[PDB]
Design a binder for this molecule. Structure first.
Ligand code: HEM
Ligand code: V55
Length: 403
């Protein structure tokens, strides 16, 4: 243990889930690469260290221990080499920018209107449960071929997978402190299998243009499909983060705009500013805050720390996006800060494959919301609480408007 960081011994998992920003402010100043005992891992907290680890040839992909316990093998986020190349080739077709531009409007905009019509005349709403999450999961769910899985169920699944994936607390001996916390991830996977296995059975014989059907068939010899055990971990990758994060990003962007009322008004009046508003929202509260990791493949020295080969490092991109070496007053949402790079989509060979898709989902959702409710106001009686260390976002977003 590093002597001057003895205070890290007293950092708790609950503290990191409720608000990691004070601890990580200390880490960025004291130890940009630091071993955090309750996480049982080195953690990268600055922009320079996160970007170096994510792009270095001396590191490769790995899943965090609780993430591996949740997803198994071969999750696209945790593999390398030929397997990673295959899984990337598998997911990339529907995510290509030219392809997304062909159909993204006809996918998301009707979905956004459907959810808006349920509440736009009420004068009040809780936008996370009633809008941001449903639009995010319904859009991706239809793309995948899960049209018949209700948005309520998709939302329950990503919540359970979230809690299992981020069940990272370890004890003195490095063993998981809360092994019972993986049970609901196991239950979610069992439910997912019961729903998706019959769909896969069908797609093997009758391919259609759902993404999962293409995952089974694309690039395969005639009459062959990828085995379902080979693609299920990447299905889980989607059913957690791909389902959850566009909703998180929408909602954090909204919370940030409400915190700057003049900027909210600017964006409602000029919706061409919505992409910039979203980019700042992702930097301000990164949806995938500290879920990603890498592992060294050779001895390497990072931020003054000599690491052996085989050392995992958690990439706390949500902290890197508050690096005061790069941003002025990063805890404040500011639509007007200059367009600078950010790490909310990761970096390197394993950077987010769905960036272009995700940005359009969030853009269209906010466009439709502001057109339907231009006089949106935050219910200042009800507070906005953010939760999560691995994945972070607001747990609710109560709003009102004069009808
Ligand atoms: C605002 C929404 C999203 C954010 C902030 C986000 C962020 C991220 C981050 C931080 C990673 C890990 C990058 C790294 O390890 O360096 C990642 C990986 C990934 N994301 Fe996104 N994501 C979002 C939405 C989506 C969506 C909607 C999809 C699919 C339609 C998607 C597909 C993927 C895939 C396939 C990977 C694994 C890439 C690989 O390991 O090769 N993401 N994402
Ligand atoms: C794109 O979805 C995911 C991304 C990550 C990145 O670390 C972890 C779990 C996920 O489900």
């Amino acid at each position: 243990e590093r002597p001057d960081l003895a205070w890290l011994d007293e950092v708790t998992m609950t503290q990191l889930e409720r608000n990691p920003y004070e601890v990580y402010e200390r880490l960025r100043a004291e130890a940009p690469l630091a071993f955090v005992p309750v996480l049982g891992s080195y953690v990268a907290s600055t922009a320079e260290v996160c970007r170096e680890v994510a792009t270095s040839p001396d590191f490769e992909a790995v899943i965090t221990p609780a993430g591996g316990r949740t997803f198994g093998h071969p999750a696209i986020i945790g593999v390398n080499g030929d397997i990673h190349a295959d899984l990337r080739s598998m997911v990339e077709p529907a995510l290509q920018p030219a392809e997304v531009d062909r159909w993204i409007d006809d996918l998301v905009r009707p979905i956004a209107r459907r959810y808006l019509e349920r509440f736009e005349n009420d004068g009040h709403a809780e936008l996370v449960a009633q809008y941001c999450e449903p639009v995010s999961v319904r859009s991706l769910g239809d793309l995948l071929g899960l049209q018949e899985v209700d948005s309520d169920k998709l939302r329950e699944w990503f919540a359970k997978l979230n809690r299992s994936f981020t069940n990272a607390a370890v004890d003195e001996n490095g063993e998981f402190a809360n092994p019972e916390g993986f049970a609901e991830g196991d239950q979610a996977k069992a439910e997912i299998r019961a729903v998706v296995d019959p769909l896969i059975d069908k797609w093997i014989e009758h391919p259609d243009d759902s993404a999962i059907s293409h995952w089974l068939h694309d690039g395969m010899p005639p009459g062959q499909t990828r085995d379902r055990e080979y693609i299920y971990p990447t299905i889980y990758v989607y059913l957690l983060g791909a389902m959850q994060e566009p909703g998180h990003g929408m909602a954090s962007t909204l919370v940030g705009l409400f915190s700057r009322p003049e900027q909210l008004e600017e964006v409602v009046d000029d919706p061409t500013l919505i992409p910039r508003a979203i980019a700042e929202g992702l930097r301000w509260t990164s949806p995938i805050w500290s879920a990603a990791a890498r592992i060294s493949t050779k001895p390497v020295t990072i931020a003054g720390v000599d690491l052996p080969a085989g050392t995992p490092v958690m990439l706390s991109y949500g902290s890197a996006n508050h690096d005061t070496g790069k941003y002025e007053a990063p805890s404040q949402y500011d639509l007007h800060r200059p367009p600078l790079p950010h790490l909310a989509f990761g970096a390197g060979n394993h950077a987010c494959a769905g960036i272009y898709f995700a940005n359009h989902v969030m853009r269209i959702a906010l466009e439709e919301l502001f057109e339907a409710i231009p006089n949106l106001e935050r219910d200042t009686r009800e507070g906005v609480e953010f939760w999560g260390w691995g994945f972070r976002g607001p747990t609710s977003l109560h709003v009102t408007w004069e009808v």
